């Protein structure tokens, strides 16, 4: 408790010594509360006018238009201590999993140089504004690095002064850039060196890309076994136990020297003990603490979520296969049985999964998995939207399984070759492309964000009639040479000024390990669509009068946007489609 967080608390006390008051009407039950101080401040979603002017039919679709308008009673909940048998299963599994992940990788520190390059090309490193304006400026000033050094030597001493979270089914815990650096220095290797790649982790998909996820799910479907299970957890980040955080910390067992000590300090001082500042309108700033739940940088959160989800799903698989009888207590011979299962079939069982942070798809040996719930519930990974003890419903067809907010279609090209393509309800895609985040967007910056969405649609969603047409229209409306942008950045092959047909060929043909015939596609007309009825099922407006008028008059919409942007160099991409090809 207060020996580890006291220093951080003491320091904040003094910078607001004219405001410190131990409030009596504090709303916290599961968070430890320490005091309050005076503040007064808040970033809503803005519409992208380039995308909206080129998607007129969707102006009257509420699922699209409502997306642009507008649980902290789940962050304030508590998770019970797992039973001794559960804790044993998790420790054995975690020990075995870090060794497997470490077989072909070497833990290492990430560098000021690496951190500096990241910031100088905009990655969402959840930092705060003070002394320097942006992250870009702090990184060039040697005063910052002297602050970093003071904290670093403090961490080596087993103490913390400035690693404090700022709070803001979503919850993002910003820290000052210095704290983020020290986290990246110790644990950045997990992401930077691809520990959760599919080649390295067998269950993972880190770096895989939306054009690969469908092929990965189809490969899992080819295994002998039961239904495909895709159970979502109710608020995964809030269900991370102190036992989970202790099994995650065992990655430090694979480290040495300085690194081992720096990593151990991040786990002890920032993850297993946390200090947070929250805005309350009653507007004061609350300084609260707790030991458990997830609150790291988003990128370390992704890797440790993937790790602990892989662990939980192997244990649920063990339960279905009858490897252990009860979570109350593992016998001595059950421990040897669990260890022996992992050595004998662990890697095979990992290959039966696709795991992306809190999101999973499992194809178990058989459907006993469906009612194997005791370990999963006792670890605190309670399933969303189903009663605690009600057996999971599995999917009989890999094309119906939800994963990473998508489903996947099998699409046969006129030439016989097989594409496995990502899909989701088209209102979601159009509604997201119509939204920007943040202030001070020029017309040129807004146009370049529209072009980023258009090129993503050309590469990932070319099989949706409305998106291929809207992508061609946006790319026709934005100057040919303007570079696509995004203020918050998997593999983003659409972020380029290269011709999108050349990029399509590289991604779907040349570099696609599931495509044996490498014959390049010569035109967009060789590239197929979903069936017309399937396109409507997934939200297409094909068949509506609104959509027919839009498609027929598209050059008028394109001209409207060109007239606003001004006298620039434009390309007509519409004749890449049959119906505009005269
Ligand atoms: C309709 C269109 O192409 N407008 C572009 C433009 C603006 N000024 N001169 C040409
Ligand atoms: Zn610290
Ligand atoms: Zn679909």
TrEMBL record:
Quaternary structure? Homodimer; in the endoplasmic reticulum and Golgi. Interacts with protein prM. Interacts with non-structural protein 1.
Q: Where is the signal peptide?
A: none
All copies of the RdRp catalytic domain together span: 226-372
Q: Which of this chain's residues are annotated to bind Zn(2+) 1?
A: 151, 155, 160, 163
Instruction: From the Swiss-Prot or TrEMBL record, give the protein name.
Output: Genome polyprotein
Superkingdom of the organism of origin: Viruses
Residues that bind Mg(2+) 2, according to the entry?
232, 359
Q: Which part of the entire sequence is included in the shown chain? A: 2764 to 3382 of 3391
Question: Where, by residue number, does Mg(2+) 1 bind?
Answer: 232-233, 358
General function of this protein: Regulates the ATPase activity of the NS3 helicase activity. NS4A allows NS3 helicase to conserve energy during unwinding. Plays a role in the inhibition of the host innate immune response. Interacts with host MAVS and thereby prevents the interaction between RIGI and MAVS. In turn, IFN-beta production is impaired. Interacts with host AUP1 which mediates induction of lipophagy in host cells and facilitates production of virus progeny particles. Required cofactor for the serine protease function of NS3. May have membrane-destabilizing activity and form viroporins.
Binding residues annotated for Zn(2+) 2, in chain numbering = 407, 409, 423, 538
* Localization, UniProt: Host endoplasmic reticulum membrane; Host mitochondrion; Host nucleus; Secreted
Which positions does UniProt annotate for CTP binding?
170, 235-237, 305, 384
């Amino acid at each position: 408790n207060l020996d580890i967080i006291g220093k951080r608390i003491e320091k904040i006390k003094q910078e607001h010594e004219t405001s410190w008051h131990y409030d009596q009407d504090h709303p916290y039950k599961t968070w430890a509360y320490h005091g309050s101080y005076e503040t007064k401040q808040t970033a809503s979603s803005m519409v992208n006018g380039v995308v909206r002017l080129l998607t007129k039919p969707w102006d009257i679709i509420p699922m699209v238009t409502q997306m642009a308008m507008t649980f902290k009673e789940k962050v304030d909940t508590r998770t019970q201590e797992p039973k001794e048998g559960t804790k044993k299963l998790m420790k054995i599994t975690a020990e075995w999993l870090w060794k497997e992940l470490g077989k072909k990788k070497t833990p290492r520190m990430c560098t000021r140089e690496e951190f500096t390059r990241k910031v100088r090309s905009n990655a969402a490193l959840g930092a705060i504004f003070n002394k320097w304006k942006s992250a870009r400026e702090a990184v060039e000033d040697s005063g910052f690095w002297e602050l970093v050094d003071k904290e670093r030597n403090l961490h080596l001493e087993g103490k913390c002064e400035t690693c404090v979270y700022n709070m803001m089914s979503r919850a993002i815990w910003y820290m000052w850039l210095g704290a983020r650096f020290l986290e990246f220095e110790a644990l950045g290797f997990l992401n930077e060196d691809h520990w959760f790649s599919r080649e390295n982790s067998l269950s993972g998909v880190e770096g895989e890309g939306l054009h690969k996820l469908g092929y990965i799910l189809r490969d899992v479907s080819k295994k002998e076994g039961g239904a495909m299970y895709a159970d979502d957890t109710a608020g995964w980040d809030t269900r991370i136990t102190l036992e989970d955080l202790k099994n995650e910390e065992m990655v430090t067992n694979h480290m040495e020297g300085e690194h081992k000590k720096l990593a151990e300090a991040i786990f002890k001082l920032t993850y297993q003990n946390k200090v947070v500042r929250v805005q309350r309108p009653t507007t004061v700033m609350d300084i609260i603490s707790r030991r458990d739940q997830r609150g790291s940088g988003q990128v370390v959160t992704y890797g440790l979520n993937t790790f602990t989800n892989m662990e939980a799903q192997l244990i649920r698989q063990m339960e279905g296969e009858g490897v252990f009888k009860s979570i109350q207590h593992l016998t001595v011979t059950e421990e040897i049985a669990v260890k022996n299962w992992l050595v004998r079939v662990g890697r095979e069982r990992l290959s039966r999964m696709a795991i992306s942070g809190d999101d999973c798809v499992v194809k178990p040996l058989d459907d006993r998995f469906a009612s194997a719930l005791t370990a999963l519930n006792d670890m605190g990974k309670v399933r969303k939207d189903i009663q605690q003890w009600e057996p999971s419903r599995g999917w009989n067809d890999w094309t119906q399984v939800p994963f990473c907010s998508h489903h996947f279609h099998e699409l046969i090209m006129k030439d016989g070759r097989v594409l496995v393509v990502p899909c989701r309800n088209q209102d979601e895609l159009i509604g997201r492309a119509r939204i920007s985040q943040g202030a001070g967007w020029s017309l040129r910056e807004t146009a370049c964000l529209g072009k980023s969405y258009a090129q993503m649609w050309s590469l990932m969603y070319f099989h949706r009639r409305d998106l291929r047409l809207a992508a061609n229209a946006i790319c026709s409306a934005v100057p040919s040479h303007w570079v696509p942008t995004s203020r918050t950045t998997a593999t983003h092959e659409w972020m380029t000024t290269e011709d999108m047909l050349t990029v399509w060929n590289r991604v779907w043909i040349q570099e696609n390990p599931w495509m044996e015939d490498k014959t390049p596609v010569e035109s967009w007309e060789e590239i197929p669509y979903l069936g017309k009825r399937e396109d409507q099922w997934c939200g297409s407006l094909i068949g509506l009068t609104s959509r027919a008028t839009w498609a027929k008059n598209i050059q008028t919409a394109i001209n409207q946007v060109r007239s606003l942007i001004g006298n620039e160099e434009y390309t007509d991409y519409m004749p890449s489609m049959k119906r505009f090809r005269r």
